[PDB]
Coordinates of C-alpha atoms and ligand atoms in Angstrom, one line a residue:
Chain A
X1 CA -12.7 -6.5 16.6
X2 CA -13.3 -3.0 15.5
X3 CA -13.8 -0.5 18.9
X4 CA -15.5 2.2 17.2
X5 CA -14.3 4.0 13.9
X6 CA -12.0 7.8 14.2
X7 CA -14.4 9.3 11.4
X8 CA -17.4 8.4 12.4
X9 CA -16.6 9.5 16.1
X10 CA -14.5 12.4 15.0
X11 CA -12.7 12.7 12.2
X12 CA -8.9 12.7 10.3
X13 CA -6.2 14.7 12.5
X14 CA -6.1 17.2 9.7
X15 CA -3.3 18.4 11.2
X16 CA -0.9 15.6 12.0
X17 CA 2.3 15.3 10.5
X18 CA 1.8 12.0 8.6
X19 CA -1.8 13.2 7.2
X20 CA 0.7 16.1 5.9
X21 CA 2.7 13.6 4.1
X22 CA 0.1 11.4 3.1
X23 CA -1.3 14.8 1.2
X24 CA 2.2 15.0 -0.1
X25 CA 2.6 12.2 -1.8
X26 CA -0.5 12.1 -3.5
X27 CA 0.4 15.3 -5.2
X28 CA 4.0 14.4 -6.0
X29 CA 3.7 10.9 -6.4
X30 CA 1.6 10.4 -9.4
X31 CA 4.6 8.7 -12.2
X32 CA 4.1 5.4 -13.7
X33 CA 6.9 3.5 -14.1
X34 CA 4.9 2.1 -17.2
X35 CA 5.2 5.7 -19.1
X36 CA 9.2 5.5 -18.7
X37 CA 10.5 5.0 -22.5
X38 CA 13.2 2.5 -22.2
X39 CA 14.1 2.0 -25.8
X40 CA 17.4 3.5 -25.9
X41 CA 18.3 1.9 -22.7
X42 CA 18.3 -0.9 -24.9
X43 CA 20.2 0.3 -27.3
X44 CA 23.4 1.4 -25.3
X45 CA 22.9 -2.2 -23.2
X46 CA 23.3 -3.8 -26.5
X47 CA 25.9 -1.1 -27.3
X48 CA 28.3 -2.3 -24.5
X49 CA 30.5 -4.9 -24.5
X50 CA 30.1 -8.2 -22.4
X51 CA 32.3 -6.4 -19.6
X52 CA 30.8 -3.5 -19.9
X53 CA 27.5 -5.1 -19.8
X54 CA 28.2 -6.4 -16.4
X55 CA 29.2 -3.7 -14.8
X56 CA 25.7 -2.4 -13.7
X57 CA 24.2 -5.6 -13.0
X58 CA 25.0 -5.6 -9.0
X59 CA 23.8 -2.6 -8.9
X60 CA 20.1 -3.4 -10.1
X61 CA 20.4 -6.4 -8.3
X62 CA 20.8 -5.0 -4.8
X63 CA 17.9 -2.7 -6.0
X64 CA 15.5 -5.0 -7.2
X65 CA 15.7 -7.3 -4.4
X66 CA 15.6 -4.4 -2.3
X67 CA 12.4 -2.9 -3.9
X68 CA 11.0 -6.0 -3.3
X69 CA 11.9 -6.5 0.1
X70 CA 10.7 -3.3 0.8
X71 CA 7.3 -4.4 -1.0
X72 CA 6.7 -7.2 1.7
X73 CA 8.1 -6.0 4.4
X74 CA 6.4 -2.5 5.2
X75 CA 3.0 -4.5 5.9
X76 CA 3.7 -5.4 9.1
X77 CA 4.7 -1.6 10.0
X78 CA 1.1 -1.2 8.5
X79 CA -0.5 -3.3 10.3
X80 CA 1.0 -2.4 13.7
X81 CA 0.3 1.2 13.5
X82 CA -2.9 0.6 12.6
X83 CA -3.6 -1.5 15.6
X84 CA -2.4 1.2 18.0
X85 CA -5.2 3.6 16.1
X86 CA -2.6 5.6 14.1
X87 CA -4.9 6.3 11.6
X88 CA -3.1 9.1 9.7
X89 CA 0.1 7.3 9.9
X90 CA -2.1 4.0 7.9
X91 CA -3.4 6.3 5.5
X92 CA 0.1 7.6 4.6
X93 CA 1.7 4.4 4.2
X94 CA -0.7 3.4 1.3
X95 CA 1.6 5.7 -0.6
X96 CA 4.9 4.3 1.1
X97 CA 3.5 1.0 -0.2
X98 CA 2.3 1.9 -3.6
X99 CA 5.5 3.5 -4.2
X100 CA 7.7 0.7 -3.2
X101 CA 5.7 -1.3 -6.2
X102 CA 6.7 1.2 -8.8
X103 CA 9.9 0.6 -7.6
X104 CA 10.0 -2.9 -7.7
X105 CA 8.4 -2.6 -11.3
X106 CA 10.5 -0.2 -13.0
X107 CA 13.4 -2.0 -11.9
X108 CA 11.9 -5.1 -13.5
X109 CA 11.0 -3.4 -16.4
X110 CA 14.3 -2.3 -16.9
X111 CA 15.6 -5.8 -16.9
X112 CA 12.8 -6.8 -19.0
X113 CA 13.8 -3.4 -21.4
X114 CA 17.7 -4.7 -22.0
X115 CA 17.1 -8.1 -22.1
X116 CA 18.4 -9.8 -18.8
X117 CA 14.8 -10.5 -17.4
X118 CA 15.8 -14.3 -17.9
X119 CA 19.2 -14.0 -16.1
X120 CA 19.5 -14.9 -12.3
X121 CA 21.1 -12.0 -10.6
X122 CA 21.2 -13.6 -7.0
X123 CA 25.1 -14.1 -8.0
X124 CA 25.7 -10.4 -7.1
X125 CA 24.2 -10.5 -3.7
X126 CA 27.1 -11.7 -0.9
X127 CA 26.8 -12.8 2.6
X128 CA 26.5 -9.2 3.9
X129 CA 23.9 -8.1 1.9
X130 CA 21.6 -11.5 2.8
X131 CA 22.4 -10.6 6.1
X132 CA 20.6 -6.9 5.8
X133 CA 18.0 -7.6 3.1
X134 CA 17.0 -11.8 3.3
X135 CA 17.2 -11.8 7.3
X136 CA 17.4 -8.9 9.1
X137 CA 14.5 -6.6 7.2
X138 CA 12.2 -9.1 7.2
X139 CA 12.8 -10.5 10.9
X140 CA 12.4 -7.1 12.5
X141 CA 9.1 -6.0 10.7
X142 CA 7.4 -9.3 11.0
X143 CA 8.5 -9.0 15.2
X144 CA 6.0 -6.4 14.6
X145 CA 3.0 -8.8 14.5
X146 CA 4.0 -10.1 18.1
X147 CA 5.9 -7.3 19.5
X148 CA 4.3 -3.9 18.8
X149 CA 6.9 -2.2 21.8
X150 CA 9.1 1.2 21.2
X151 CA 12.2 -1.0 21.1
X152 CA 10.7 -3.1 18.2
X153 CA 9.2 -0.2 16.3
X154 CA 11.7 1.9 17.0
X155 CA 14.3 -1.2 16.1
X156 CA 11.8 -1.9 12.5
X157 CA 12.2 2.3 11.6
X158 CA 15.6 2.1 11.8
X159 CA 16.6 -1.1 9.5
X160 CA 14.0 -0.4 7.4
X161 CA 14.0 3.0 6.7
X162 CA 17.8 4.6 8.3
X163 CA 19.8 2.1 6.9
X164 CA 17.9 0.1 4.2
X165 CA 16.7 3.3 2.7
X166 CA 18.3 6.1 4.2
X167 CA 22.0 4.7 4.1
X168 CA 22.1 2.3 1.0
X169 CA 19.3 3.2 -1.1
X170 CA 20.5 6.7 -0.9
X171 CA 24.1 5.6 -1.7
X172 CA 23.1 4.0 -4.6
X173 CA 21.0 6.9 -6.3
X174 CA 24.4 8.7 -5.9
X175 CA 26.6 6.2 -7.4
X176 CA 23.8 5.6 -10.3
X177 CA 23.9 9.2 -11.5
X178 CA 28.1 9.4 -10.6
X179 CA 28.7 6.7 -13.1
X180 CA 25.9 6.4 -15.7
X181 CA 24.0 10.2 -15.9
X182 CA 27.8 10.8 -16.4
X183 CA 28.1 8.4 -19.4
X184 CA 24.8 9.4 -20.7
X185 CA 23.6 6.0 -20.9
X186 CA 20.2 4.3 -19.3
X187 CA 17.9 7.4 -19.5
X188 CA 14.8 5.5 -18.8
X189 CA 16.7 4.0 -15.9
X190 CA 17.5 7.4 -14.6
X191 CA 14.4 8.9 -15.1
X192 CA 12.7 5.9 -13.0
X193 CA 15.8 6.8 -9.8
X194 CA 15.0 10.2 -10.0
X195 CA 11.3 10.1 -9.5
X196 CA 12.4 7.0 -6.9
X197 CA 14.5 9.0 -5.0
X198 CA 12.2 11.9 -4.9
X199 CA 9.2 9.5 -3.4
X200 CA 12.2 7.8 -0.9
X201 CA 12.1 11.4 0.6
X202 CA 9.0 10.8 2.5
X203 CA 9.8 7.2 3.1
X204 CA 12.7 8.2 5.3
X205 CA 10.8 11.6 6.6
X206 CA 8.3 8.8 7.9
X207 CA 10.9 7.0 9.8
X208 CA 12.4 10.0 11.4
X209 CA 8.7 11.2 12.5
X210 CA 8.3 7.0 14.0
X211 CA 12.2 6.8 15.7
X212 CA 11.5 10.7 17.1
X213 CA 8.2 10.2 18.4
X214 CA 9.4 7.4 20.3
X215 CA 12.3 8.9 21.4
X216 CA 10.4 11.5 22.6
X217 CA 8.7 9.7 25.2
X218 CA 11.7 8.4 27.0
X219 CA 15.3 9.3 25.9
X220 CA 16.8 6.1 26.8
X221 CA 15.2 4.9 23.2
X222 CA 18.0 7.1 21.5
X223 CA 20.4 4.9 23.0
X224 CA 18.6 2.0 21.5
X225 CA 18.3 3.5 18.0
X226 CA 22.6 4.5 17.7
X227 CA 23.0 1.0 18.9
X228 CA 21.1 -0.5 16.3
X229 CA 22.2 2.0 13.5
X230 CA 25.7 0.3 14.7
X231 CA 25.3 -3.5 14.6
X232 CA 24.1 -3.0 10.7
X233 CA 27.0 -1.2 10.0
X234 CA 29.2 -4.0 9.2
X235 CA 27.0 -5.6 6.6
X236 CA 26.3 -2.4 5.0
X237 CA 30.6 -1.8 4.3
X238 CA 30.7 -5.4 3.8
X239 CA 28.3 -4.9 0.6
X240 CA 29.9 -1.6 -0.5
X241 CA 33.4 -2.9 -0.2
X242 CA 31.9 -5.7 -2.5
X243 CA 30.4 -3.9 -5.0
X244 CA 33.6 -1.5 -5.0
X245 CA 36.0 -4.9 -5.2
X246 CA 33.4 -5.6 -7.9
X247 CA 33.7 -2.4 -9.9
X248 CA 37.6 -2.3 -9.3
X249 CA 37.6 -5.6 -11.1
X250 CA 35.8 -4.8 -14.1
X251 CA 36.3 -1.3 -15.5
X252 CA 36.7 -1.3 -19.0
X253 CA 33.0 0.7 -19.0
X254 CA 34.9 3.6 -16.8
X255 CA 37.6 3.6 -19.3
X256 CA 35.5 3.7 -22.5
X257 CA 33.8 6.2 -21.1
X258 CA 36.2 8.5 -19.4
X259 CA 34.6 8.0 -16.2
X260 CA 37.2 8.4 -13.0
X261 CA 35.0 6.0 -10.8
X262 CA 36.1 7.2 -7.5
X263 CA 34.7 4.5 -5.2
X264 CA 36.4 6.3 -2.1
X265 CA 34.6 9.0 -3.1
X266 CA 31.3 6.7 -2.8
X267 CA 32.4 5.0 -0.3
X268 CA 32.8 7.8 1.7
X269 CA 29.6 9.0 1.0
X270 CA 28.1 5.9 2.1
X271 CA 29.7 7.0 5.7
X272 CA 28.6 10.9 4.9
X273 CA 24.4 9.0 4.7
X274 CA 24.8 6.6 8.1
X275 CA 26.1 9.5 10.3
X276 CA 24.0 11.8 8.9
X277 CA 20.5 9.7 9.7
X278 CA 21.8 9.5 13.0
X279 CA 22.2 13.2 13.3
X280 CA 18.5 13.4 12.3
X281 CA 17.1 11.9 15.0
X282 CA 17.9 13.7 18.3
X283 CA 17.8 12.5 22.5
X284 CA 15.4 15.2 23.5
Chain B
X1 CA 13.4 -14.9 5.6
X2 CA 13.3 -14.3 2.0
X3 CA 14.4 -17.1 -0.2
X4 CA 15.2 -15.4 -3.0
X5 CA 13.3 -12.4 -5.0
X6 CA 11.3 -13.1 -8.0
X7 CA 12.6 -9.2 -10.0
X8 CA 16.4 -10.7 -9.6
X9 CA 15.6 -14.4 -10.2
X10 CA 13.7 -13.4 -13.4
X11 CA 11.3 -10.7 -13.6
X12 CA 6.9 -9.7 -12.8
X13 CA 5.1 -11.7 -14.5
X14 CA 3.3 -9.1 -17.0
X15 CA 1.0 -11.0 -18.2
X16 CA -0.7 -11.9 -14.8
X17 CA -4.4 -10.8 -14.3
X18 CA -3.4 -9.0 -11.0
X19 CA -0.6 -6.9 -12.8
X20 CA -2.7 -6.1 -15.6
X21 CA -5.3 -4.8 -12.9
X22 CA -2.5 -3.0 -11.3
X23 CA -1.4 -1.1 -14.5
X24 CA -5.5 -0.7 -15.1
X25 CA -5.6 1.3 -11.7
X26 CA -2.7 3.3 -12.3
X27 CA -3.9 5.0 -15.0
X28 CA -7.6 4.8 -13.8
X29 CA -7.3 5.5 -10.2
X30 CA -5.7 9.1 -10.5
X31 CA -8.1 11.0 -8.4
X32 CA -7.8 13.3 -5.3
X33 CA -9.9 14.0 -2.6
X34 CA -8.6 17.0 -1.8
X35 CA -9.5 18.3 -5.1
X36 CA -13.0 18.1 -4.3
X37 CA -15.0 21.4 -4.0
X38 CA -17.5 21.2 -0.9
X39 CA -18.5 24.3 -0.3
X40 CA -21.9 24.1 -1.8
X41 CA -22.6 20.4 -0.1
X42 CA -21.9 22.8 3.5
X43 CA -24.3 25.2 2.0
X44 CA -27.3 22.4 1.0
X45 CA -26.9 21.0 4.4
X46 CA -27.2 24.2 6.1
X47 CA -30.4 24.5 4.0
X48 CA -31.7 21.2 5.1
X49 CA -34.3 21.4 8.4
X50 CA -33.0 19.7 11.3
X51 CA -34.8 16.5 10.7
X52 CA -33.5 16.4 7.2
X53 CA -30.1 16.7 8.3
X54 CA -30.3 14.0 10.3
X55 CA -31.9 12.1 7.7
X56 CA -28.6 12.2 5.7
X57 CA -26.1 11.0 8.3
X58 CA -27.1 7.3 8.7
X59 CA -25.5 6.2 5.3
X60 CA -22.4 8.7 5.5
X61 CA -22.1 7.2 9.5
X62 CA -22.4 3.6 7.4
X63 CA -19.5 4.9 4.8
X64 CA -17.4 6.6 6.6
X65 CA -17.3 3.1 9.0
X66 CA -16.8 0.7 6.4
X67 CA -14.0 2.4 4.5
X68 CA -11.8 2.8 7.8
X69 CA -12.5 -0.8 8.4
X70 CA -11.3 -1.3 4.5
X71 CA -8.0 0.4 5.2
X72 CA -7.6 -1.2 8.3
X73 CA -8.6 -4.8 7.6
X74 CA -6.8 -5.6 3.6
X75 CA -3.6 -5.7 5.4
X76 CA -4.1 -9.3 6.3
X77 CA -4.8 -9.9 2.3
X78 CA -1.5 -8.5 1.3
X79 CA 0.4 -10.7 3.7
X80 CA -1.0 -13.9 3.4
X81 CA -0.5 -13.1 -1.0
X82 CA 2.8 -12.0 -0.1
X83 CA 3.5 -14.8 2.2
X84 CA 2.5 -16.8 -0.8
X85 CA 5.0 -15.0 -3.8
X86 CA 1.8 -13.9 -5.5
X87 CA 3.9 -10.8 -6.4
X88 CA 1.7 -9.5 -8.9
X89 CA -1.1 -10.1 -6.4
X90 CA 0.9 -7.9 -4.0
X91 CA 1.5 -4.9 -6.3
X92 CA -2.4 -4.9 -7.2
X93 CA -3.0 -4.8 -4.0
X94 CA -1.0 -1.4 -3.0
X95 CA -3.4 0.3 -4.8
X96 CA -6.3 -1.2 -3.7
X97 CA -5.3 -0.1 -0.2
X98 CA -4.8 3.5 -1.3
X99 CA -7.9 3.6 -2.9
X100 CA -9.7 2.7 0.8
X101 CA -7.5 5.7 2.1
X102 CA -8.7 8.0 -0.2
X103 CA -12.3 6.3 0.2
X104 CA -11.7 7.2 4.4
X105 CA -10.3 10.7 3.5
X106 CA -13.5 11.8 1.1
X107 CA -16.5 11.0 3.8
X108 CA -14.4 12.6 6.6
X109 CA -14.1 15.7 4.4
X110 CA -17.4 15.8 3.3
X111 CA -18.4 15.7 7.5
X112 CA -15.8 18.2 8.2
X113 CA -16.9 20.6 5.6
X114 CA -21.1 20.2 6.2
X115 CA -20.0 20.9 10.0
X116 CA -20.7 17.8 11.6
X117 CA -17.1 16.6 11.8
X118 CA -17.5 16.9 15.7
X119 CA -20.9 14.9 15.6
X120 CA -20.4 11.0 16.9
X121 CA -22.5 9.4 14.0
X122 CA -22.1 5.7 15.8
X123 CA -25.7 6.4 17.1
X124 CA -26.3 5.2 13.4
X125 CA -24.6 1.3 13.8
X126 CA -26.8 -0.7 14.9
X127 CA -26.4 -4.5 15.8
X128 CA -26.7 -5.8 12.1
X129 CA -23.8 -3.1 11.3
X130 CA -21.8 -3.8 14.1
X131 CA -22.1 -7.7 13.5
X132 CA -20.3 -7.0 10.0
X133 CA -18.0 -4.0 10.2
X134 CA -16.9 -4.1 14.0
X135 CA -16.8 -8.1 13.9
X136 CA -17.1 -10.4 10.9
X137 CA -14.8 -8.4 8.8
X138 CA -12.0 -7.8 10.6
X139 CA -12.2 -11.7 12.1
X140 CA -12.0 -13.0 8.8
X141 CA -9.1 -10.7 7.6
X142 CA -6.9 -11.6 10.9
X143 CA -7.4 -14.9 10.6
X144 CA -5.4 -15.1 7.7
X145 CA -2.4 -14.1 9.9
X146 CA -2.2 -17.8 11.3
X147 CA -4.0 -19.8 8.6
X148 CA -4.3 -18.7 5.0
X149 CA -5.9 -21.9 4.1
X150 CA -8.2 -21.8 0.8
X151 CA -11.2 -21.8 3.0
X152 CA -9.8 -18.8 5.3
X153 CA -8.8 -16.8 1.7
X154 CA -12.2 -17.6 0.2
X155 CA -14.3 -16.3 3.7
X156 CA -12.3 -13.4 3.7
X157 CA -12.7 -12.0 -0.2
X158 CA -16.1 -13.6 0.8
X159 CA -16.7 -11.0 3.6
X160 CA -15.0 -8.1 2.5
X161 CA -15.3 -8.2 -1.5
X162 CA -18.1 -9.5 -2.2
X163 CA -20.8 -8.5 0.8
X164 CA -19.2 -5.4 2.1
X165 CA -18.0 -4.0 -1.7
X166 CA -20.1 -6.0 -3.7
X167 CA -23.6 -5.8 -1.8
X168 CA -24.0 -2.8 0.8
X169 CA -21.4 -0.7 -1.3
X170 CA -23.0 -0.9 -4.5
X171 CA -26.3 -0.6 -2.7
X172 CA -24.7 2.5 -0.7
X173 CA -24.0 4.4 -4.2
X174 CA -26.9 3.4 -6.1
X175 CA -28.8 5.1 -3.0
X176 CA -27.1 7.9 -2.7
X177 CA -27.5 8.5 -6.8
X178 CA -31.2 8.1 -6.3
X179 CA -31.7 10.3 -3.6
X180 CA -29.3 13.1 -3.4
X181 CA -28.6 13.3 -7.1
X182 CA -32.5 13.5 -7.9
X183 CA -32.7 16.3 -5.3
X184 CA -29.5 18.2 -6.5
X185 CA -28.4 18.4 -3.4
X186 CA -24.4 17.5 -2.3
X187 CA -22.5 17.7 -5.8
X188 CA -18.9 17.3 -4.0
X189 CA -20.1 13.9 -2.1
X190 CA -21.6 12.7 -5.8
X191 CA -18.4 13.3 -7.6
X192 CA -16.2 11.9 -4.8
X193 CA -19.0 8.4 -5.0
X194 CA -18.7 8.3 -8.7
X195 CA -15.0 8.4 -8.6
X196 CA -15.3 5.7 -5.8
X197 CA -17.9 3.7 -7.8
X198 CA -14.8 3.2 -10.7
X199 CA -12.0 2.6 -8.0
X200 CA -14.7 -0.2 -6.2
X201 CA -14.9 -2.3 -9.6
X202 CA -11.4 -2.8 -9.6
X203 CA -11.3 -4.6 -6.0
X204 CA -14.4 -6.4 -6.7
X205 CA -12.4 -8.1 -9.6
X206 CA -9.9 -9.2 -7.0
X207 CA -12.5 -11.1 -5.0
X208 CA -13.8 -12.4 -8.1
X209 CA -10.3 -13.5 -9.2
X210 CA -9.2 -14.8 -5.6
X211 CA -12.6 -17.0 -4.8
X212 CA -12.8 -18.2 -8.2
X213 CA -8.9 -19.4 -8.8
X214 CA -9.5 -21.1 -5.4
X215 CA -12.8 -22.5 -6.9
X216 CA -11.3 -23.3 -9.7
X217 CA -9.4 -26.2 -7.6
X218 CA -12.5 -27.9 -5.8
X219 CA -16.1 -27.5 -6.1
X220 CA -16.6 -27.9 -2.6
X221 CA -15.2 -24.7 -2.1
X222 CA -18.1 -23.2 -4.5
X223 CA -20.5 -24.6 -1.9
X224 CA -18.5 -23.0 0.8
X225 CA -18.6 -19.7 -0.8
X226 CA -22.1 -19.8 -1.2
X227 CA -22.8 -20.7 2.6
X228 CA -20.9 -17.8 3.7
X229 CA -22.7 -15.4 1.5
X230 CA -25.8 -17.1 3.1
X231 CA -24.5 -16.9 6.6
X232 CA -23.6 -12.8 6.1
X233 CA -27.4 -12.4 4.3
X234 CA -29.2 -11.7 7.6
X235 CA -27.4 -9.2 8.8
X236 CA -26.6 -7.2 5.5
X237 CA -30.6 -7.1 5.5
X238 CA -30.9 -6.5 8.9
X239 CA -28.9 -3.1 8.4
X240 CA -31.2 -2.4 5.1
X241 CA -34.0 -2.6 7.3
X242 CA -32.9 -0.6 9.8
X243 CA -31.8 2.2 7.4
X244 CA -35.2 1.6 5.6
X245 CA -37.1 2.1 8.9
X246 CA -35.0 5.6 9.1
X247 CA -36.3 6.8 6.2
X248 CA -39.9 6.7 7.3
X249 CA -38.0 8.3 -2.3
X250 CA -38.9 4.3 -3.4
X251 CA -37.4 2.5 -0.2
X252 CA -38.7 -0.8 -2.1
X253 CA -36.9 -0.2 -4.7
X254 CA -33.8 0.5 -3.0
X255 CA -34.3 -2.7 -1.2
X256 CA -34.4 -4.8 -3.9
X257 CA -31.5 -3.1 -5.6
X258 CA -29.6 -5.0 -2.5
X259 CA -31.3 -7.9 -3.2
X260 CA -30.1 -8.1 -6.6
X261 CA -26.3 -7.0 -6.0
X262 CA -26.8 -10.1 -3.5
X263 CA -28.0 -13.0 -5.9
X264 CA -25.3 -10.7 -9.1
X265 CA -22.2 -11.2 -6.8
X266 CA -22.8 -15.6 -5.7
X267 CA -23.9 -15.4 -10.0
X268 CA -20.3 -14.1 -10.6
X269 CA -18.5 -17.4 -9.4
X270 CA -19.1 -20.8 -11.1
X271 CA -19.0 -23.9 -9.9
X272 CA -16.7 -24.9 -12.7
Ligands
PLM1 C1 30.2 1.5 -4.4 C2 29.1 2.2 -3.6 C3 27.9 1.4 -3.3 C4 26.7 2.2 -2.9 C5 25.5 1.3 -2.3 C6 24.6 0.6 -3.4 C7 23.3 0.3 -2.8 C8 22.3 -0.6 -3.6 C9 20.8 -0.3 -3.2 C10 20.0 -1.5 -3.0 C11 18.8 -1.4 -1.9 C12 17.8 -0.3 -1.9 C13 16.4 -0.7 -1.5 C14 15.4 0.4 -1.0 C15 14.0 -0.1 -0.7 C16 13.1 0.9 0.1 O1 12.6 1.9 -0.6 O2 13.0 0.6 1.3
PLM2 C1 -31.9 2.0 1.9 C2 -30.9 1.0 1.2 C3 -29.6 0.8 1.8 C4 -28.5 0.3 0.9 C5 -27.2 -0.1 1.6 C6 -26.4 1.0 2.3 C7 -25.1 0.6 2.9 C8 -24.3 1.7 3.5 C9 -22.8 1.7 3.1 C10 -22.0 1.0 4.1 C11 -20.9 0.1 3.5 C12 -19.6 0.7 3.0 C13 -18.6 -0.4 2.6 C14 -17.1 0.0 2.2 C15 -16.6 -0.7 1.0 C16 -15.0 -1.1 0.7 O1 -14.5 -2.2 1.3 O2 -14.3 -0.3 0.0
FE2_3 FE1 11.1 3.3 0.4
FE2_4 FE1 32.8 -10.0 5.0
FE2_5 FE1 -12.9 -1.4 -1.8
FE2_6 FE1 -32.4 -7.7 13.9
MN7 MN1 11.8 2.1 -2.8
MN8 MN1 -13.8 1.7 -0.6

């Protein structure tokens, strides 16, 4: 049952942080994946060689199936802010969830685009990254329906958006534009990461305001929050050294094209995003 | 867990009526409250007399109440669909969502700027209201949670798409239109309902598609659909009495408009 309603007692917290967002991505979150021209994406798919072709596939498949993950999974982040009255926070992630499905659609339309909509690209996704994105996302939101605590909040914010968004999907924008802006191939494909990493801005802005506000009400949460950055860890090096064993294996698209793939150079960025989101939130 | 993921297995199904709403309210559903101009609505209210004023806040108090409980009380739709892999289903959704936060956003502007932002309008809920907004609507929503049966999905669209959107909505707008438009008075709320009026046909196509796909399975679920628009009738015209009563402009006329959007939305699903 409803108690009462916030705006027709009162009315929005003009001033809270999340309304600020919330105002934020209406304004810069108006694209349409639909709009991105993909016909010469295409072209250079069809241009590359079987190997070559490959290449990029384990790429959009960690992203596709992360997209749509993410999808799902924020609803129950949703749904428990909302029951604790966090109106402005609810209005905000409409947007978070409206931009996650133009994420999961421009990926698929990208697919569609090049002609591999019809291939199953579950082969590319290895223990460690079922571990973060089949189980572990979607069994610490849906706690969320039962167990609405700080741990589990603050435990949801941090696989969700630290290391699910702010660690890998972060890394993988990155290696995108290192390998294939470089190439100049997939321009539809990289208009569609540029306006997703611009909306993934907020998306992690939101989970620093969640993990921090917790935080702030009893320091022994930021304990809790490096802890759980740490456990994930493991499975997020276990999918980059994949996808790097991956790319080592097949690399005639870095030699056609020039490119000195330097996945120490990712992978070290990968380590530059997790110890960087952890510097972002703070004990006090 | 998640099984799999339909966008790696294969891809969206584009050709699904949900996705094809989706795309509609992408392109259609580009509007911002924030862009709205109310400085002349806070200088016709300051015009009004004191009983005037007060004459206006029992349908914004009505509004502003049911869109909040809109944002609040979809989620349960998007989970059970999602818990389903109706994908498409899903991604409509998102924007029906945002669409209720921008609905939330433009009445609590509209009070902030006419100056009665501080005013608790709850006064204006009586028990008809509160048997809807505070109670049946967000009991059938939740239940979905635990039991997203066809008879749980087809009370909930029931509920909230087609007797909260479909009946005192529409009513809401066509009265508003009617009153404050003939009087010229409130420009900024108009534009904000008009653009509201174009997002609300969109999600009222959802609880056509949802009840009648389900429908489309069993006719005894017609008969269901029609009992719980029957069960809701009393109290949706208990609140159009109540409001009516306020306002003592063609009040009959008004009522009957209700009446109408009542017998349109149980004429928008066939038993076949
Ligand atoms: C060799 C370096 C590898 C770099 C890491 C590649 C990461 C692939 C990204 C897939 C998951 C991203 C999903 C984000 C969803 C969301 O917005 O929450
Ligand atoms: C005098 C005639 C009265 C006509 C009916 C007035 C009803 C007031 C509006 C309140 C309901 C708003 C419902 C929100 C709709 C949504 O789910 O998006
Ligand atoms: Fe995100
Ligand atoms: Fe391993
Ligand atoms: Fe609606
Ligand atoms: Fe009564
Ligand atoms: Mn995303
Ligand atoms: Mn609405």
């Amino acid at each position: 049952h409803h108690d009462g309603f916030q705006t027709v007692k009162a009315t929005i917290d003009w001033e809270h942080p999340m309304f600020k967002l919330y105002e934020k991505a209406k304004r810069n979150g108006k694209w349409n994946p639909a709009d991105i021209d993909f016909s010469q994406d295409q072209k250079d798919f069809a241009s590359l060689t079987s190997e070559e072709k490959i290449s990029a596939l384990p790429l959009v498949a960690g992203f596709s199936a992360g997209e749509e993950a993410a999808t799902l999974d924020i609803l129950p982040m949703a749904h428990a802010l909302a029951r604790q009255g966090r109106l402005e926070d609810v209005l905000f992630l409409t947007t978070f969830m409206h931009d996650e499905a133009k994420h999961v659609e421009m990926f698929s339309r990208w697919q569609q685009a090049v002609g591999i909509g019809q291939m199953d690209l579950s082969v590319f996704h290895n223990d460690h990254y079922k571990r973060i994105f089949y189980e572990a996302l979607p069994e610490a939101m849906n706690r969320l329906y039962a167990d609405d605590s700080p741990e589990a909040v603050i435990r949801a914010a941090t696989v969700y958006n630290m290391i699910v968004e702010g660690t890998l999907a972060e890394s993988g924008y990155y290696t995108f534009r290192q390998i294939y802006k470089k190439a100049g191939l997939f321009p539809g494909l990289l208009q569609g990461i540029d306006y997703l990493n611009m909306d993934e801005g907020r998306h992690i802005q939101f989970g620093i305001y969640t993990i921090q506000r917790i935080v702030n009400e009893d320091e022994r949460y930021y304990e809790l929050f490096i802890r759980y950055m740490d456990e994930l860890w493991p499975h997020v090096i276990g999918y980059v050294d994949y996808l790097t064993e991956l790319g080592k294996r097949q690399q005639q698209l870095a030699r056609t094209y020039a490119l000195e793939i330097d996945y120490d150079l990712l992978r070290h960025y990968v380590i530059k995003q997790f110890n960087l989101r952890k510097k972002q939130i703070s004990r006090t």
